[PDB]
Structure 1
Amino acid sequence: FRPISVFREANEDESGFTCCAFSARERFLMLGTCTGQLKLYNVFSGQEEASYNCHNSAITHLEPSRDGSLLLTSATWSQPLSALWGMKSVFDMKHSFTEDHYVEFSKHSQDRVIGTKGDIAHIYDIQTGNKLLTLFNPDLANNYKRNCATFNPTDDLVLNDGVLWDVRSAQAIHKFDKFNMNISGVFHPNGLEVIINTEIWDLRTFHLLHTVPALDQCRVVFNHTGTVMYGAMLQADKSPFGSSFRTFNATDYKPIATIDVKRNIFDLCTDTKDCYLAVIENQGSMDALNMDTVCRLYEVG
């Protein structure tokens, strides 16, 4: 991971980048900020290219669609907590999701949005914005404190609060036991395993395939071939993450690298080609008290 570029937020005395994703226009990165703005930056020069007002509180997370036409944002406390933005030509709001504090696109065909409100999953149509489905069963809930509902790669299954749902029938097909307080888990890109905190469960049998202690309290992202997994640990009970992330072999979960940037991390992402890793790093001497973030661009060897 060779450092390639660094930049802080233009015009601002305290730099307030909070999250990032590469845009479809290569060389440009989209960043959310602590004032609810969405900004476009040239990642090599550090030049701010555009700024938009998306939310009345800090942006926590964002996701661009693969075709570059749409963007999901989530804020901290102000409603709407999440929104869908059109990026073709004019930048404008398409839909808003009032109470969903976290949203993702569907994965195969990006025609739906899945939102999370506490223990509950909401599925929306991108065109109409209508709520198509609510997935929640109080008897099966695990009540994960940082529950995030998510589609599997072919969009036919949902993982919500440690419960696996069949989307077409809107039926819970399996509840995974609760072994931590916060993390509800994600699908592996191979479509055949789920990663729920330290537990790798087989979707063919529900057997425990792996125990991966290093994944405790981690959020993860995969490179686009599905061969490497990045993981960074949430800060427990301020920056969302600690100062290190780790790479893992995506097939056997054996560690590859441990990278300690010595600054607390707010977000990271990679480009479609996996040439680059962008990381939001806090320079602040007392973590998020005096938040002062930079974006570092690293070369993926």
Structure 2
Amino acid sequence: SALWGMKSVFDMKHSFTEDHYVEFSKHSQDRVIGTKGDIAHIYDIQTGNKLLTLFNPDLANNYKRNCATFNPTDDLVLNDGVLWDVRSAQAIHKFDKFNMNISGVFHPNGLEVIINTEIWDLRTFHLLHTVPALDQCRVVFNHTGTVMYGAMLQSPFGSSFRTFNATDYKPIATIDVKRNIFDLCTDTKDCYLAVIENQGSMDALNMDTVCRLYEVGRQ
């Protein structure tokens, strides 16, 4: 993984040889976190050193795709489905594993934790809800955090979309995209969907993977 630069000069301004998935810090973007296997490293951008590497061998879930993220208050980390208070390098609460793949994500309200299909609490740690249409889908929120997007990661991948609400998790729409969805990104200003779809049949020998822009809210 490489922190490049995009002001006007294009260079690897810091290099990593280790982590399979790097991610910024949300509110104050001076921190970049990244995760190899079950080990997640906190880096700075100014000097690029290891700030604090957090891991507890007694407590990890060993998910298949671990991706440590931050809460929007920049205080909690979901490594291996374990919260982490970044003030004093301690673990808070392991969750119960159910689905072998997905290590979870924060909901933008700062009140919940969304493990794969189980909706948790941040202060009471109670299972509020369970949405079975979230079965192994990568989630993307709006910039306002008012809708959740869903793309299947099932072998085919993404025979449709999945439009969710961010308050009550009611399904809005499953629009049928006949090809296979591989990636999904949306605007900050809520007008387009960046959709990587694969042409042809399910062919690992020939992949014609195009990008198709949708428009939000037009028949």
Q: TM-score of the superposition, structure 2-length normalised?
A: 0.96
Q: Confirm or deny: 8 A CA contact 2:102 2:116 kept in the other structure.
A: yes
Q: Percent same amino acid among aligned pairs?
A: 100
Deviations 1:66-120 (A, max 9, x none): xxxxxxxxxxxxxxxx110110111111111111000111001111111010011
Deviations 1:50-73 (A, max 9, x none): xxxxxxxxxxxxxxxxxxxxxxxx
Q: Which runs of 5+ in 1 are unaligned?
A: 1-81
Cα deviation, residue 216, structure 1: 1.5
Higher relative contact order (CA 8 A, sep 6+): 1
Cα deviation, residue 221, structure 1: 0.6
Cα deviation, residue 224, structure 1: 0.9
Cα deviation, residue 259, structure 1: 1.9
Instruction: Find out whether 1:100 has 2:19 as its counterpart.
Output: yes
Cα pair distance change 1:267/1:251, threshold 3 Å? same
Cα pair distance change 1:123/1:259, threshold 3 Å? same
Cα deviation, residue 290, structure 1: 1.1
Aligned counterparts of 1:142 and 1:84: Cα–Cα separation in 2: 29
Cα deviation, residue 169, structure 1: 1.0
Cα deviation, residue 242, structure 1: 2.1
Aligned counterparts of 1:121 and 1:240: Cα–Cα separation in 2: 30
Cα deviation, residue 288, structure 1: 3.5
**RMSD (Å), alpha carbons:** 1.3
* Secondary structure in structure 2 of the residue aligned to 1:214: helix
Deviations 1:185-233 (A, max 9, x none): 0000111100000100011211111101111111101011111000112
- Please identify which structure carries the higher strand content: 1
Residue 173 of structure 2: aligned partner: 257
Q: Confirm or deny: 8 A CA contact 2:152 2:181 kept in the other structure.
A: no
Q: Confirm or deny: 8 A CA contact 1:144 1:183 kept in the other structure.
A: yes
Aligned counterparts of 2:80 and 2:145: Cα–Cα separation in 1: 24
Q: Confirm or deny: 8 A CA contact 2:157 2:181 kept in the other structure.
A: yes
Q: Confirm or deny: 8 A CA contact 1:158 1:164 kept in the other structure.
A: yes
Aligned pairs (5 A) from 1:157-168: 157-168=76-87
Cα deviation, residue 137, structure 1: 0.6
Aligned counterparts of 1:201 and 1:112: Cα–Cα separation in 2: 26
Aligned counterparts of 1:145 and 1:240: Cα–Cα separation in 2: 19
Q: Confirm or deny: 8 A CA contact 2:151 2:184 kept in the other structure.
A: no
Q: Confirm or deny: 8 A CA contact 1:284 1:293 kept in the other structure.
A: no
Cα pair distance change 1:244/1:289, threshold 3 Å? farther
Aligned counterparts of 1:84 and 1:207: Cα–Cα separation in 2: 37
Aligned pairs (5 A) from 1:1-301: 82-235=1-154, 241-301=157-217
Aligned counterparts of 2:55 and 2:145: Cα–Cα separation in 1: 30
Q: Confirm or deny: 8 A CA contact 1:264 1:287 kept in the other structure.
A: no
With 194-203 and 282-291 compared, the bigger mean Cα shift is at 282-291
Deviations 1:227-255 (A, max 9, x none): 100011212xxx88322220101101110
Deviations 1:5-49 (A, max 9, x none): xxxxxxxxxxxxxxxxxxxxxxxxxxxxxxxxxxxxxxxxxxxxx
Cα deviation, residue 260, structure 1: 2.1
Cα pair distance change 1:118/1:211, threshold 3 Å? same
Q: Confirm or deny: 8 A CA contact 1:145 1:181 kept in the other structure.
A: yes
Cα pair distance change 1:145/1:177, threshold 3 Å? same
Cα deviation, residue 284, structure 1: 3.0
Deviations 1:242-299 (A, max 9, x none): 2222010110111001022111112111111011111000003234431111111011
* Secondary structure in structure 1 of the residue aligned to 2:193: strand
* Secondary structure in structure 1 of the residue aligned to 2:190: coil
Aligned counterparts of 1:126 and 1:240: Cα–Cα separation in 2: 38
Aligned counterparts of 2:195 and 2:170: Cα–Cα separation in 1: 23
Cα pair distance change 1:299/1:185, threshold 3 Å? same
Q: Which runs of 5+ in 2 are unaligned?
A: none
